């Protein structure tokens, strides 16, 4: 029921939204924001929104976050127009360029001022991309922090550990696309394809509103021990590596199963979460349903308010 919009901001964020449209996420509405008008028109990215027509005459941001932020301030009204009506917005961007690092904080602040649940899902550049890009991404994330409800960062450097031997540069970037998608999907599917333990959107709000920094990981398992093994793989994910989970102010957990989920399995996942979780912690655990699933399970864990 709750209306979810997904906004890719900038070239990396548009590459992420393009993959999400093609691969499909059920029940969300897609948009791309960019300063580069030619890149906006190249492929199927849902509804497009050009920003910074005055400053950057459709030619891009020149990899400079000051120009991408200036471009965003020009047509705040354009963004407010298309965001209007949503209950939740995911903003996806690769930090460390020009448009994403500078325009994503502004898109986030507009969404907030409409009372929308604003979730940023952003990447940090690979180490081989250089120190300047990484430093840019840090300031844009700090700027982004002022005007979001939750900020999930995906450091691409942690994906290198799970990448195949001899992989291509292109496939490495496409793998980071899949993680952003799996990240939006794992949260949004609690609303768009609920299971028996359907999460109320007001509870999603409690666990993500005005929370600050967040991290997520996931596991998957099949067989008799699918519940405990998927849950432990998620808490052991390399994207949660550096996070002490007992220090999170909120935990949001999505159990994706078919129709065969047993009571002792829902107990088991929750026991696992509640054992580490602090006691001043909002804990929200629901199921989502995937029908083409048999004797298997996915568990997604979002630790919110870790700042």
């Amino acid at each position: 029921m709750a209306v979810i919009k997904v906004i890719g901001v900038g070239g990396g964020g548009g590459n992420a939204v393009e993959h999400m449209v093609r691969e499909r996420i059920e029940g969300v509405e897609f948009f791309a924001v960019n300063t580069d008008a030619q890149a906006l028109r190249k492929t199927a990215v849902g509804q497009t929104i050009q920003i910074g027509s005055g400053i950057t005459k459709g030619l891009g941001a020149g990899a400079n976050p000051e120009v991408g932020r200036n471009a965003a301030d020009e047509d705040r009204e354009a963004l407010r127009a298309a965001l209007d009506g949503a209950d939740m917005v995911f903003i996806a961007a690769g930090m460390g360029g020009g448009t994403g690092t500078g325009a994503a904080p502004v898109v986030a602040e507009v969404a907030k001022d409409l009372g929308i649940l604003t979730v940023a899902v952003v990447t940090k550049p690979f180490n081989f991309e250089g120190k300047k890009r990484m430093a840019f991404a840090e300031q844009g994330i700090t700027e982004l922090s002022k005007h979001v409800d939750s900020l999930i960062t995906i450091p691409n450097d942690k994906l290198l550990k799970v990448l195949g031997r001899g992989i291509s540069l292109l496939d490495a970037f496409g793998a980071a696309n899949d993680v952003l998608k799996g990240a939006v999907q794992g949260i949004a599917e609690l609303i768009t394809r609920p299971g028996l333990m359907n999460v109320d959107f007001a509870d999603v709000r409690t666990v993500m509103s005005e929370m600050g920094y967040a991290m997520m990981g996931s596991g998957v398992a099949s067989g008799e021990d699918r519940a405990e093994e998927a849950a432990e793989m998620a808490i052991s994910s390399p994207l949660l590596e550096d996070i002490d989970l007992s220090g999170a102010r909120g935990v949001l957990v999505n159990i994706t199963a078919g129709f065969d989920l047993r009571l002792d399995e829902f107990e088991t996942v929750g026991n696992t979460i509640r054992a580490f979780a602090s006691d001043n912690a909002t804990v929200v655990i629901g199921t989502s349903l995937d029908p083409d699933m048999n004797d298997e399970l996915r568990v997604t864990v979002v630790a919110t308010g870790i700042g």
Partner: protein, 91 residues
């Protein structure tokens, strides 16, 4: 360009009652693969089994000659939700 995981699936050997399938090594670690098969159009429930994520082949046995089968390989990975790949074959 294939977009599914795995990106390629082929029968690499075939006997009257068995098929050996091959797929390509994935760009991203796979926990396990889920393989299903059954007679194309049949009324009988599809069969299935899992192989570990570090395998690039599997053997389907117990089949009967001169029957067309549909074979589907799901890749289960914590790092994506990519669609499965599927092929047809007659024993």
């Amino acid at each position: 360009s294939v977009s599914s995981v795995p990106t390629k699936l082929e029968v690499v050997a075939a006997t009257p009652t068995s098929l050996l399938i091959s797929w390509d090594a994935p760009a991203v670690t796979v926990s396990y693969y889920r393989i299903t098969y059954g007679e194309t159009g049949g009324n009988s429930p599809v069969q299935e089994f899992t192989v570990p994520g570090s395998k690039s082949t599997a053997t389907i046995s117990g089949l009967s000659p001169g029957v067309d089968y549909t074979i589907t390989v799901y890749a289960r990975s914590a790092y994506h939700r990519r669609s499965p790949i599927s092929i047809n074959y007659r024993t």
